[PDB]
């Protein structure tokens, strides 16, 4: 009826009070005894060229060698980052691709974008020619992110304020996750693939479990759209970069803000966020044409990655941590070590 | 070095040959983004310019051997501050207005696309659509144009351009006053990098001419001749 607004406000006030009671003192008083990381220098070991338009997303393969990249020219290019050798160059049905993924087995590769559909291509097939194997449709808004659980199912997040879990062989939606008010911009899958997180563009992040399918936890600390999200290596935390030129860190059990990576000189928002092998380095992409390398604990911007002539769009660290890759809007992929 | 000899020749060389083959095709086409409200009649424009040539619709048309791909966004939510960044490097943006309450929203939308960070340097072709409806409405007399915009009351014809067809000054005055509002919002900011080309609404030739002007202006800017 008309009395539900005040009851919901009281419930949210109770949530705020319970969160406040769970906080004892400022975090800066606990991590001030740790050794500062120092200063990080990265240099471009190799730059992968060949894309025409701006690169919008890219994903490392399970092996630390192969890596797929999606560009708005309509191309999905697979590189062997060791020798800068291209392996496949798949043309796309729709040139407006906003996300791409690499299957954990390396057999399949997913893509999607403004056409609201997710395309699954098979790499290791007869005659060695890449052909489309599945076209999952059903999302209303533009498909913003997609991540493989295995060769059988893939999780997608679209701009219609929804996420979904698919079924490649059947082609239908096994389950759908709703609750976000703005468009979901990025999703990150836990290492166990039992839960994932969605950073929608409503200054809110949500945690879902794929087996049942309701929002377990909701975190609201940012003040603008969340553009990127990624799990901590242990799976018990995650970092969200937003459009207010801030990164933040969340812990599921704590259910609170932990770290707030920001600086006065930083003006443009965050485009991509990824962690490192140990979780001691958070790499973030910015509209200022460069990436930054924060410390998870110290939170003082240890390193800077400069050399991109346009906006940095995609970021990704391999599973073994031996390299990082940055794809920018100047149609360039850069490998750093 | 023989294990990665064929693994390089068969893959990288052929893929680069294909990439060079389709790069010239990509560069030889002009990508346009079609914008407009649900009552702007942009679909009629699409059909009109497509007959003689789910999340997004593509309309490939070519005028005197120049290829144009026009993208009309459909089956999308109203919140469009996010996917609008995709059209960063389109050659032009087509804006269609139903100039016939309704004009304030269209003016604000054009203002918003004008000042966006990612659309700062991309010019816009303005289509003041539905001219016959505007003429009939202004000649009708029941609908007053000066109450939605009091500035029209103290307005005079710009006299820089003339109405070629035989029509009374009232319709010309209203039709140029709406264009004046749009052009004032356009020229308030955004100087040098991008411009706006207004047309009262064939359209294929208009789009071709404005794209030619845009490309020539950009090329002359690269030579510091403008």
């Amino acid at each position, epitope marked *: 009826l008309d009395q539900l607004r005040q009851e919901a406000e009281q419930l949210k006030n109770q949530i705020r009070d319970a969160r406040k009671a769970c906080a004892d003192a400022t975090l800066s008083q606990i991590t001030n005894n740790i050794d500062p990381v120092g200063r990080i220098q990265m240099r471009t070991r190799r730059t992968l060229r060949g894309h025409l338009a701006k690169i919008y997303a890219m994903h490392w393969g399970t092996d630390s060698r192969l890596l797929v990249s999606a560009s708005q020219d309509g191309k999905l290019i697979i590189w062997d980052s060791y020798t800068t050798n291209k392996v496949h160059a798949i043309p796309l049905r729709s040139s407006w691709v906003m996300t791409c993924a690499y299957a954990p087995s390396g057999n399949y590769v997913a893509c999607g974008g403004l056409d609201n559909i997710c395309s699954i291509y098979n790499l290791k097939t007869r005659e060695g020619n890449v052909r489309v194997s599945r076209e999952l449709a059903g999302h209303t808004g533009y498909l913003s992110c997609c991540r493989f659980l295995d060769d059988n199912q893939i999780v997608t997040s679209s701009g219609d304020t929804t996420c979904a879990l698919w079924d490649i062989e059947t082609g239908q939606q096994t389950t759908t996750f709703t609750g976000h008010t703005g468009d979901v911009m990025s999703l990150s899958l836990a290492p166990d693939t039992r839960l994932f997180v969605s950073g929608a563009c409503d200054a809110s992040a949500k945690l879902w479990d794929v087996r049942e399918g309701m929002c377990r936890q909701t975190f609201t600390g940012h003040e603008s759209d969340i553009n990127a999200i990624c799990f901590f290596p242990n799976g018990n935390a995650f970092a969200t970069g937003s459009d207010d030129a801030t990164c933040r860190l969340f812990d599921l059990r704590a259910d609170q803000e932990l770290m707030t990576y920001s600086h006065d000189n930083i003006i443009c928002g965050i485009t991509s966020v990824s962690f490192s092998k140990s979780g001691r380095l958070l790499l973030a992409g910015y509209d200022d044409f460069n990436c930054n390398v924060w410390d998870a604990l110290k939170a003082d911007r240890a390193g800077v990655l400069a050399g991109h002539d346009n906006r940095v769009s995609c970021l990704g660290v391999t599973d073994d941590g031996m390299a990082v890759a940055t794809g920018s809007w100047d149609s360039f992929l850069k490998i750093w070590n | 070095q023989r294990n990665e000899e064929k693994a390089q020749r068969e893959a990288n060389k052929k893929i680069e040959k294909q990439l060079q083959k389709d790069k010239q095709v990509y560069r030889a086409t002009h990508r346009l983004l079609l914008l407009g409200a649900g009552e702007s009649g942009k679909n009629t424009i699409v059909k009109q310019m497509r007959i003689l040539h789910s999340g997004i619709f593509e309309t490939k048309f070519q005028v005197d051997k120049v290829n144009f791909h026009m993208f009309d966004v459909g089956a999308q939510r109203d919140e469009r501050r996010k996917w609008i960044q995709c059209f960063n490097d389109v050659t032009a943006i087509i804006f269609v207005v139903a100039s016939s309450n309704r004009l304030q929203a269209a003016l604000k939308l054009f203002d918003s696309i*004008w000042n966006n960070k990612w659309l700062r340097d991309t010019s816009v072709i303005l289509f003041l659509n539905k001219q016959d409806l505007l003429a009939e409405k202004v000649l009708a007399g029941k609908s007053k144009i000066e109450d939605y915009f009091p*500035e029209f009351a103290r307005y005079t014809t710009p006299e820089d351009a003339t109405p070629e067809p035989g029509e009374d000054p009232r319709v010309t005055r209203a039709k140029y006053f709406i264009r004046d509002e749009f052009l004032r919002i356009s020229t308030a900011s955004g100087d040098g990098r991008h411009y706006c080309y207004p047309h009262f609404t064939e359209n294929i030739r208009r789009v071709f001419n404005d794209c030619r002007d845009i490309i020539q202006r950009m090329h002359l800017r690269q030579y510091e001749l403008l």
Partner: nanobody
Amino acid sequence: QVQLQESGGGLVQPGGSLRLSCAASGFTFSNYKMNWVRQAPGKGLEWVSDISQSGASISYTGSVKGRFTISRDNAKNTLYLQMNSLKPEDTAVYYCARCPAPFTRDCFDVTSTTYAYRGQGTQVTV
């Protein structure tokens, strides 16, 4: 979470005067551009007025071009719209609206049907 809450407005005769003040919480007010939107019965959202980053550049619609006063107070963290010479057609529900991004002079989806950083609205009836 972001939170905008506006002072209400009671029923007044045509030509009356009121005041709609909305207070903000959860963000740096001084770093954002704030607009007004109103929803009339049987009508969609329509933007009314706006305030620049520093509070200098202002703009109105034709209907309220010379009837309403728009202002913002950073210290009190509020934005006010003082209404003068009201009309029966101004009866609507008023929401303060926020630019989705800081540091920018323009933004979209302020008048959207499901915009996130919009207030609950006050019923101004004439």
